[PDB]
Amino acid sequence: TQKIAFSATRTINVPLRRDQTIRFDHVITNMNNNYEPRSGKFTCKVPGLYYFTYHASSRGNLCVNLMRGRERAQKVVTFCDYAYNTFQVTTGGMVLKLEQGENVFLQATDKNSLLGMEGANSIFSGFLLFPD
Amino acid sequence: QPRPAFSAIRRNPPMGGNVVIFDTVITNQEEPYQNHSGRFVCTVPGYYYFTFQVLSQWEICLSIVSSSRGQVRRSLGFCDTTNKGLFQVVSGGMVLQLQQGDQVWVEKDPKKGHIYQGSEADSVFSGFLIFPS
Amino acid sequence: KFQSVFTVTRQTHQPPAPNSLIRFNAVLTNPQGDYDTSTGKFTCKVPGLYYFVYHASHTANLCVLLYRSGVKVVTFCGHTSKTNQVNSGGVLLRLQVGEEVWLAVNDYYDMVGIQGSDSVFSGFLLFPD
Numbered sequence: 001t002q003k004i005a006f007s008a009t010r011t012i013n014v015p016l017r018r019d020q021t022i023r024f025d026h027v028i029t030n031m032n033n034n035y036e037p038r039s040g041k042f043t044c045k046v047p048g049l050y051y052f053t054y055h056a057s058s059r060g061n062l063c064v065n066l067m068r069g070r071e072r073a074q075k076v077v078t079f080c081d082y083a084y085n086t087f088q089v090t091t092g093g094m095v096l097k098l099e100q101g102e103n104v105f106l107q108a109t110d111k112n113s114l115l116g117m118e119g120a121n122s123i124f125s126g127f128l129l130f131p132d
Numbered sequence: 133q134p135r136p137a138f139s140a141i142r143r144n145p146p147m148g149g150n151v152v153i154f155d156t157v158i159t160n161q162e163e164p165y166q167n168h169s170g171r172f173v174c175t176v177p178g179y180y181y182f183t184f185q186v187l188s189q190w191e192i193c194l195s196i197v198s199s200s201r202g203q204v205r206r207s208l209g210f211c212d213t214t215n216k217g218l219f220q221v222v223s224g225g226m227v228l229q230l231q232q233g234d235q236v237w238v239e240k241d242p243k244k245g246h247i248y249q250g251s252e253a254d255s256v257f258s259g260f261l262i263f264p265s
Numbered sequence: 266k267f268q269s270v271f272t273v274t275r276q277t278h279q280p281p282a283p284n285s286l287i288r289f290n291a292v293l294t295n296p297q298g299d300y301d302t303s304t305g306k307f308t309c310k311v312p313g314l315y316y317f318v319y320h321a322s323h324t325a326n327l328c329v330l331l332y333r334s335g336v337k338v339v340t341f342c343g344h345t346s347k348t349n350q351v352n353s354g355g356v357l358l359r360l361q362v363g364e365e366v367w368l369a370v371n372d373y374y375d376m377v378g379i380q381g382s383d384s385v386f387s388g389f390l391l392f393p394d
């Protein structure tokens with residue numbers, strides 16, 4: 001019986017650099033501890049089908065790449081959402097079939113306006129749908 | 133056991149009609165989703181969750197629609213009417229109890245149906261079984 | 266049942282009162298009666314890991330806050346002037362029997378979506394325990 005799930009928010013007050021792995025340091029949930037707060041990466045132990053999602057608060061233009069891979073990561077998709085002199089909350093999600101050892105994470109881009117704070121959260125979550 | 137789940141995105145979609153076709157499959161366990169029509173087909177009866185995150189630069193209104201016995205069932209709508217020429221992600225989602233043969237898809241409002249076409253960013257349509265009936 | 270799932274919607278033109286709980290009065294699916302439209306609260310019957318997500322339409326500033334047993338878990342805000350946008354949010358929570366989950370607004374309470382843009386709140390049990 002493999003109960004795997006994680007929800008982590010970003011509280012670190014530091015800007016995001018281009019191609020930087022976006023870290024969600026604050027864990028709300030981390031069943032089976034397959035998600036690592038220090039890196040912001042999920043690493044598959046149990047292969048199977050997973051759903052990944054995020055909600056990012058932002059004060060400007062923001063683009064995020066959803067990444068997948070083992071020792072070499074690749075990008076599944078890119079989610080962009082713009083804001084001109086205003087605040088926004090954007091979202092993205094993806095169902096991915098995962099093999100043992102593969103890791104999934106979000107990577108920042110040239111558009112790095114992302115807020116991580118009390119009253120304006122940025123969260124990253126993932127859960128196992130069906131085990132391989 | 134059933135593992136119906138999918139995610140499809142837009143890249144080279146056939147335009148025409150109000151059905152939004154997500155032509156590029158990322159995941160399609162048990163091939164419920166037809167990339168040629170933009171429709172999900174229920175095989176396993178039960179409760180499913182469907183959600184979309186679509187990119188627009190102007191005005192867009194989208195709805196997750198379903199059909200049962202060929203009968204169309206209109207539902208909730210979700211819009212973004214910023215209309216400033218800048219990327220905006222409209223999102224929506226819901227749980228749907230489906231019977232064998234039911235179909236689910238995303239439809240656009242003909243008067244507000246602008247969906248970004250390009251390589252800068254993506255629009256996604258996802259769905260998965262929560263539990264069988 | 267031994268499962269838990271719901272999708273409720275807010276069907277009214279009047280937005281919520283500021284700094285109050287967001288009531289979803291209409292049901293799309295709610296077989297176990299876990300979400301109570303009379304109080305606007307979900308109450309756990311079956312313990313385990315749940316996923317909660319919402320998509321709220323608004324035409325003025327809106328912040329949606331998710332609460333779990335009296336504790337504010339997450340807050341997401343969307344700013345807009347006259348036009349319609351969708352504020353989204355979600356979180357995975359491992360709940361115990363009797364625990365309450367609900368959404369609330371702060372001073373930014375607008376949920377007046379344009380004709381055709383709605384507001385939904387869904388929740389479902391993924392892993393029993």
Ligand SMILES: [Ca+2]
Nearest residue numbers: 081082088220
């Ligand atoms: Ca935006």
